[PDB]
């Protein structure tokens, strides 16, 4: 298992333009395109995304390309940021899976915004971490893929994923 087969059991692929769980336009593997309501605005950006006129579908490939950059996105996205280095550096290798996880379903700023908990992690303090992540609006929208992130950080193995 890694953070490539780990994103994609709880994100899935979908090569035509959905609503993700917040009813937001995305395509591929979680691949966020816009806020906007509108889907003009989203085969727009889709276009631009891809580089070709795709009338809101994709191949398999391309849903790949964007799921490459997107990982690395997010992993630069988090050494570069202040909060987050630090508590990345401290993990090990499963747990570090995990927190790209949460950074690429929510962006660097809403991770950010877990300061309580990137304490308890920095800390190793797995138990007290896993009961604060659980309070949260992230662990209530979304309770199946929370948890299996959770359990991630709980324990240092893949067993929820298995
Ligand atoms: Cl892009
Ligand atoms: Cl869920």
């Given at each position: 298992m890694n953070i490539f087969e780990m994103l994609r059991i709880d994100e899935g692929l979908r090569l035509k333009i959905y609503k993700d769980t917040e009813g937001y336009y995305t395509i591929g593997i979680?691949?966020?395109?816009?806020?906007?309501?509108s889907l003009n605005a989203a085969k727009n950006e889709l276009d631009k995304a891809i580089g070709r006129n795709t009338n809101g579908v994709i191949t398999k490939d391309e849903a790949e390309k964007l799921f490459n950059q997107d990982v690395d996105a997010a992993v630069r996205g988090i050494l570069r940021n202040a909060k987050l280095k630090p508590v990345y550096d401290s993990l090990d290798a499963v747990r570090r899976a995990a927190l790209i996880n949460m950074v690429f379903q929510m962006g660097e700023t809403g991770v950010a915004g877990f300061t309580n908990s990137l304490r308890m992690l920095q800390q190793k303090r797995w138990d007290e971490a896993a009961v604060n992540l659980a309070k949260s609006r992230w662990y209530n929208q979304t309770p199946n893929r929370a948890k299996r992130v959770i359990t991630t950080f709980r324990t240092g193995t893949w067993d929820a994923y298995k």
């Open positions: 979680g691949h966020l395109l816009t806020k906007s309501p």
